[PDB]
């Protein structure tokens, strides 16, 4: 989905219920109930690598000197500065 | 003195006691009990201006961008780098 573009660990094979079926070239987002083209997803790709659609997590806690954080809210190709402990 | 080369605010005019009197061209230091020539004082003059004999104070707290600190322990013509807050 636009919210979960990546595949997830899938404990359940399939499930009942209402399922939005529309032709390809369109990915489902729940807020705008219909399916929509992929580009309309608020998807995030900062410094190249593939990941989720801008999860709200502060990556890289481990190393202070390598504290090179890059959040993404919806679309922004931004990177934030780390506050030094010293 | 070598420790207090500058004149100080002097609440008392004069005082009793033992007083080291020796000819001029020699300034008193208390550690080496006698008076000694001025150059032997661990005196400090960093970037030109006249001040004490290297007081152990971190000058210039006010402005971060102008944080241009210059300590002097005894003799060194050194200046230390300020740690940035960002």
Curated annotation (Swiss-Prot), chains A, B:
Disulfide bonds: 41-44, 79-82
Domain TIL: 1-41
Residues bearing glycans: 76
Origin: domain of life: Eukaryota
Name of the protein: von Willebrand factor
Organism of origin: Homo sapiens
Name of the gene this protein is made from: VWF
Whole-protein coverage range: 1156 to 1241 of 2813
């Amino acid at each position: 989905t636009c919210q979960h573009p990546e595949p997830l660990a899938c404990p359940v094979q399939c499930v009942e219920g209402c399922h939005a079926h529309c032709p390809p070239g369109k990915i489902l987002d729940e807020l705008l109930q219909t399916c929509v083209d992929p580009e309309d997803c608020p998807v995030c790709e900062v410094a190249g690598r593939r990941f989720a659609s801008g999860k709200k997590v502060t990556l890289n806690p481990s190393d202070p000197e390598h504290c090179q954080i890059c959040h993404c809210d919806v679309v922004n190709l931004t990177c934030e500065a780390c506050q030094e402990p010293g």
